Amino acid sequence: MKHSLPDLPYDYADLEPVISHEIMQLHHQKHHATYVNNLNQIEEKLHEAVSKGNVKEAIALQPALKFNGGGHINHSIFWTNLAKDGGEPSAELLTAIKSDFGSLDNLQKQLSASTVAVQGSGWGWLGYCPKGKILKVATCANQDPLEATTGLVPLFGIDVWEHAYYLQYKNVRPDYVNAIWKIANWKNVSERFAKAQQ
Amino acid sequence: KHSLPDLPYDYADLEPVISHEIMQLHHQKHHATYVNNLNQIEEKLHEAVSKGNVKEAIALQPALKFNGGGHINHSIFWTNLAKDGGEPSAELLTAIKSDFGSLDNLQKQLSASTVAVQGSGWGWLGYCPKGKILKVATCANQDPLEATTGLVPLFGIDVWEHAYYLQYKNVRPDYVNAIWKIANWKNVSERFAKAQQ
Amino acid sequence: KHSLPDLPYDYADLEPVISHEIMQLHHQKHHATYVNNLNQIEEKLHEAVSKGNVKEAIALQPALKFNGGGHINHSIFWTNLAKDGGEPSAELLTAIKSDFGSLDNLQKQLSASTVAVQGSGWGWLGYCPKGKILKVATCANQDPLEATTGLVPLFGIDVWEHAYYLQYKNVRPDYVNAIWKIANWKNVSERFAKAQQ
Amino acid sequence: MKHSLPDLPYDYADLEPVISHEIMQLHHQKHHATYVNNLNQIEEKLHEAVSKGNVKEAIALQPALKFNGGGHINHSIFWTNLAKDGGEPSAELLTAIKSDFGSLDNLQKQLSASTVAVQGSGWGWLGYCPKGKILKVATCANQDPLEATTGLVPLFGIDVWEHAYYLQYKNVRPDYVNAIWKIANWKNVSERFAKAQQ
Ligand SMILES: [Mn+2]
Ligand SMILES: [Mn+2]
Ligand SMILES: [Mn+2]
Ligand SMILES: [Mn+2]
């Protein structure tokens, strides 16, 4: 068993004009592949340490597992979160969206603001709190994955690492964050919401 | 399986620097709890990693560092103390003088850094295998020195309030100063020798 | 200048939940130290910012958060406790039931989160002005709730070991459970009303 | 009194082929300018809070001051750290370099490795410990400035935020980190070392 780089649900140029094909190819083939490749090696070293009962070595490996494992989790979710033909939120999801945010417009505004405000590299997420049964906006630093680090089940994420938009948008992160809503795969988000309530 | 080590001395053997009650609680309750939790968390982590459950493996990280670190830190700490801990080896004293000027200077610097810890944590005299020099470092909570910094621990000062409160109350500096009276230089010297291998 | 507030009760008035000695040390030593240090650090920060010394201003940040936070947190904490603290207001109980199902559920959730704090910190019942709902949150060390999260503090549980060790020793959960007996619901209710303005 | 965007010691295309003119212009006119502009506003708000004795507000402003103030400190140092004609380390500096690293080659190797290993956005620095009287390699996250956060006096820094190299180097951060040594302003580093020993 090993982790593998998932195929994108679309071709590399399918998200143009919102995300360029060069960003998509680099992001997928170089950035995500690197996280996966490192993840496999780190997981092996971690299993080795844990099997030995070597607590020092297991702790030492934690930042690398979080970063690469998180990188893999986050990008895997991200690819599915996007579509040229996203559709619209499910009836169940919109009820909750209206309940916790008032409207879809309020949700998009709040997620966009929080995401743009990330200092350095990171992610913005729409998440579901299983315990509170409530929808939440959260941000994560670097590749810290949402669920593992907060308990929130990720529904929709926006990658704001500079590699996610710089070639196209340069320093103008807000233009990317607002434009990404045009390609939000609501069908996928709705599916994730349904699973998160199980 | 990880186990609570026996102390190298009786619980009252470090009085009047650290009381019987502190030693007993610190060993039988605090360290024991870290060990027990460590075993539980290590088992869960083994399962998660075995099955390639990266989410679960990441989720367990704070608990493993805290409890695993607690086990590492306290295991070292007990061996770092003694009723009569002697003096640094010739080799260690040479290194101390080289890196800190004098034993008094080392004590002063490590004590000051340790006292300055905000909240719970540890003060450490450590050896850097890369620079081949001694260094003062502090760690938050139960973050273990070597796993998190690469520095090999030689002498640690626990400044979690449970390490001194029953006796010293708020006066952490007095505990940090007094612990030098029971520093087990035989052990610190042995750790220094091993760190150089 | 920042000053140590007088307690709303005598030092032994919270017995047998929190001892006279704990209250006296916690107030006269721990809180007093945060206040004294806060005044020193605020003065240095005023000077640094006045002169546009960004380096110095940044360097003072851990000390200001720790000591300023200590002052904020303990100031609230004293008012959150009482010998006879009554019951939540009608309004607060409605909000508690809405957000947590029951007062018992709130107590359980906040107690569990607070007990789970690794190292030194605080447990808080807070009000989110954005969501207009009650929330359980924890803070590390002296990180103050509102400045760091935006949540308005309503009821806090200090789990720094100095808050309970002399009496409860390692058994933090018993202290966290017992503190509900002296929760000053009059004050929590007043804070809730003010948070809604 | 206010903070201002310093002029670069050279023209925008002067660091080509090692750093492109588009990177330099964006980095200076957009990224650094943003930090300065925000810094001025945040410092005013902080002075207001501190003058009032409003501890909550002063604490609340800390991340924004660290980030923007740090951004300003770091980039200000960075521009001076580079040159088409850097020269060579001073006699005093090289003695210390040899003492703490064995050689210049060992220093460059170690700083390069640490810098490349930064997870997310950050900086790699050659720093001077005033207390230990020793040279150290350190890294900083996001815009955390070296001296304020560690006590180490910065001598030479390498910006590894993706905006510092992506347009040119794409994902290949190591090529940028190794190539930046070609433009290291040793005269400036030597000057900083001399001041740090005072
Ligand atoms: Mn990415
Ligand atoms: Mn301890
Ligand atoms: Mn306290
Ligand atoms: Mn930069």
Residue numbers in the entry:
A (entry chain C), D (entry chain C): 0 to 197
B (entry chain A), C (entry chain A): 1 to 197
The article reads:
MnSOD-2 and MnSOD-3 are homologous proteins and are both synthesized as precursors with N-terminal mitochondrial targeting signals. Here we present the structures of the two MnSODs which are strikingly similar to that from human. Gel-filtration chromatography indicated that the pure proteins were tetrameric, a result that was confirmed by analytical ultracentrifugation (results not shown). Similar to other reported MnSODs, the tetrameric quaternary structure in MnSOD-2 and MnSOD-3 is accomplished through interactions of the N-domain α-hairpin.
